[PDB]
């Protein structure tokens, strides 16, 4: 896991994460790839920190979009999309 790969995976989620609505196929696919790549505790902690960085790019981030993404994509998300998560607890 690198932050560049996290950014690539989550890029198609940016409109949903910033405007609400539904994630869409490309976003759900991106998140499933990420979730697939966060296979170890280290990978998960690393991904968590990169996702937190990404989430903190957008002053207009919709936290409830972020919170609804796993249910809308049908996945158990190992690394939640959050601006404030402490990644040590992942
Ligand atoms: C369970 C994941 C396998 C699906 C692989 C690509 C799916 C992309 C569209 C995602 C929509 C959610 C599907 C689902 O997990 O039920």
Resolution given for this structure, in angstroms: 1.9
Q: From the CB of 29, is ligand 1 less than 6 Å away?
A: yes
Can you give the length of the chain in residues? 90
User: How many CA atoms, within 13 angstroms, populate the side-chain half-sphere of residue 69?
Assistant: 32
3-state secondary structure of 78: coil
Experimental method: X-ray
Architecture of domain 1-90: Orthogonal Bundle (1.10)
Q: How far from each other are the two terminal CA atoms of the chain, in whole angstroms?
A: 15
Is 28 within 8 Å of 65 (Cβ atoms)? no
- 12, 13, 23, 32, best to mutate for ligand 1 pocket (most atoms within 8 Å of CB): 32
How many Å apart are CA 46 and CA 67, to the nearest integer? 20
Residue 27, token pair as written in the block: 């976003």
Ligand 1 lined by 28 (C-beta under 6 Å): yes
Domain boundaries, the chain: 1-90
What CA–CA distances, in Å, run from 4 to 9, 20, 47, 68?
Answer: 9, 24, 10, 24
């Amino acid at each position: 896991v690198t932050c560049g790969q996290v950014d690539a995976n989550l890029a198609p989620c940016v409109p949903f994460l910033t405007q609400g609505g539904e994630p869409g196929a490309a976003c759900c696919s991106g998140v499933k790839t990420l979730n697939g790549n966060a296979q170890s505790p280290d990978d998960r902690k690393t991904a968590c920190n990169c996702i937190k960085a990404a989430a903190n790019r957008y002053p207009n981030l919709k936290d409830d979009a972020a919170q609804s993404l796993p249910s809308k994509c049908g996945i158990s998300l190992n690394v939640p999309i959050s601006r404030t998560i402490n990644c040590d607890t992942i």
